[PDB]
């Protein structure tokens, strides 16, 4: 079970940056949430939220990789330290893990895909 107040709202083809909205009325405490992000076949990659990070009812937080270049400051702007971008490419898939280990979100771009109805 999940309350479901946050969703990944943005996430930067260039590998910069994603941002989460919390789209309740109700503020979120995030202590220790992990973005998941799947590129390709490739090792998964987690960012962790600092154990004190709360997303206040309606608000939104974007997470950059320690490479991008962009000032930090919480709760806005955070960093990802040591990982210089979220990767690049054809499939990746960003995912929101809560404290206790479940999946509660999650946005994917996928590029160049072939549908059938066959």
């Known amino acids: 079970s999940t309350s479901g ?6 996430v930067d083809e ?22 998941k992000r ?9 960012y962790w939220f600092p154990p004190k990070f709360t ?8 997470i950059w990789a320690a ?7 919480p709760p806005t702007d955070l960093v ?3 990982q210089n971008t979220w990767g690049c490419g054809n499939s990746l898939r960003t995912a929101l893990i809560n404290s206790t280990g479940e999946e509660v ?9 072939t549908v059938v109805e066959d």
């Open 55 to 62: 997303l206040k009812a309606g608000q939104v937080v974007t």
């Open 80 to 82: 990802w330290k040591a």
């Open 105 to 113: 979100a999650m946005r994917k771009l996928v590029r160049s895909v």
């Open 14 to 35: 260039e590998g910069k940056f994603v941002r989460l909205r919390n789209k309740s009325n109700e503020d979120q405490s995030m202590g220790n949430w992990q973005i």
């Open 38 to 46: 799947q590129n390709g076949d490739d090792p998964l990659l987690t």
């Open 5 to 10: 107040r946050v969703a990944v709202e943005e």
């Open 67 to 73: 490479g991008a270049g962009a000032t930090h400051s």
